[PDB]
Write a protein that binds this ligand. Structure first.
Ligand SMILES: Cc1cnc2c(C(N)=O)cnn2c1
Length: 352
């Protein structure tokens, strides 16, 4: 392992997603106790044990019992997923958006198990450390030139589809990558129509697992009430909406944005959220959450056979009589409907 073989720009990206150091920092930011059970000793069974105990928590909330029923359930959860609340007594998990908070945590943790496994497999042979990680990812990362028409589309995709309601930060595209996870091309539903290039943002610790294992669905033991539109793979057409799931801070103001070709097909359109949306798909190939703002049909350029909704995100006239989501929510429930294509290294410009 002498001189690295990878592109210098790829080397920068490899070190970034493969930093076990910040992985602890973000888990500690989520209040996870790295001391009581370090990330290095994280079994998938522990996470499947965590999911089950979250389901026992939804079983309490649905039954409405807030006594010991919930107090025992939450503690049992915390024992498998050690937390750190210090002074205050640990909190009771009571809401759909508190449930989603922990399913977010268990996902990020599972994507870290994948990660540390890949960094621990580096032995010490004839390859440079960074090159060994890349090979283990079994996914290709071609860096694109800033003057590429691909780059021209992405920057105009990035900023022109930045929602006006996420004004507390501007976004700036530091580099752009061509993604091809091995086998993904070989199974993408080429048949399905409505082929679109959709956003997915995720925390920094998750990208090794995402570039290696794709974007899986939720395990069966997960609480069903936790997922907004059901156990699927969520996307958005607005760059800022997916960039919010990057969870960049004013101090760690860099992130990664996953533009992937999503085979949506015929959409089931919904206004109010509903987790049991997978049961009511009935031949439709995806669920679409209907918002007020979205890129207008008059700016839909095509890139490698996929529709890229540019232009300013005009209004859509959507309004629910009975909550109306502001922005559109796409959900595909099988990975064959998703092929990753472009990854974006994005710097966040927060405003005070
Ligand atoms: C319910 C839900 C979950 N995740 C996302 C993302 C993302 N992960 O980038 C975008 N919209 N969205 C919506």
């Amino acid at each position: 392992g002498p001189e690295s073989q990878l592109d210098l720009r790829v080397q920068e990206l490899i070190k970034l997603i493969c930093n076990v150091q910040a992985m602890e920092e973000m888990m500690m930011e989520m209040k996870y106790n790295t001391k009581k059970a370090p990330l290095g000793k994280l079994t998938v069974a522990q996470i499947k044990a965590g999911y089950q105990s979250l389901k026992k928590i939804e079983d309490c909330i649905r039954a409405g019992q807030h006594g010991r029923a919930l107090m025992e359930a939450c503690n049992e959860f915390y024992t498998r997923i050690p937390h750190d609340f210090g002074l205050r007594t640990p909190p009771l998990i009571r809401t759909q958006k508190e449930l989603s908070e922990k399913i977010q945590l268990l996902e990020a943790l599972g994507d870290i198990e994948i990660a540390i496994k890949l960094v621990k497999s580096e032995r010490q042979g004839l390859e440079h450390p960074l090159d060994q990680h890349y090979r283990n990812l079994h996914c290709a990362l071609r860096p694109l030139d800033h003057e590429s028409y691909e780059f021209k589309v992405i920057s105009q995709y990035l900023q022109s589809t930045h929602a006006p309601t996420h004004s507390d930060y501007t976004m700036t595209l530091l580099d752009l990558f061509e993604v091809e996870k091995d086998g993904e091309k070989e199974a993408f539903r080429e048949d399905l129509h409505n082929r679109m290039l959709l956003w997915h943002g995720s925390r920094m610790s998750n990208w090794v697992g995402i570039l290696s294992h794709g974007l899986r669905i939720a395990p069966p033991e997960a609480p069903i009430t936790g997922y907004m539109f059901g156990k699927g793979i969520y996307f958005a057409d607005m760059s800022s909406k997916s960039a919010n799931y990057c969870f960049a801070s004013r101090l760690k103001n860099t992130g990664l944005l996953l533009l992937s070709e999503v085979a949506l097909g015929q959409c089931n359109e919904l206004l109010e959220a509903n987790p049991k949306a997978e049961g009511l798909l009935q031949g439709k190939h995806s669920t679409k959450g209907l918002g007020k703002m979205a890129p207008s049909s008059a700016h839909f350029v095509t890139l490698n056979g996929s529709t890229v909704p540019l232009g300013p995100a005009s209004d859509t006239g959507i309004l629910n009589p009975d909550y109306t989501l502001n922005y559109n929510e796409y959900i595909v429930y099988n990975p064959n409907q998703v092929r990753m294509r472009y990854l974006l290294k994005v710097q966040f410009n927060f405003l005070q």
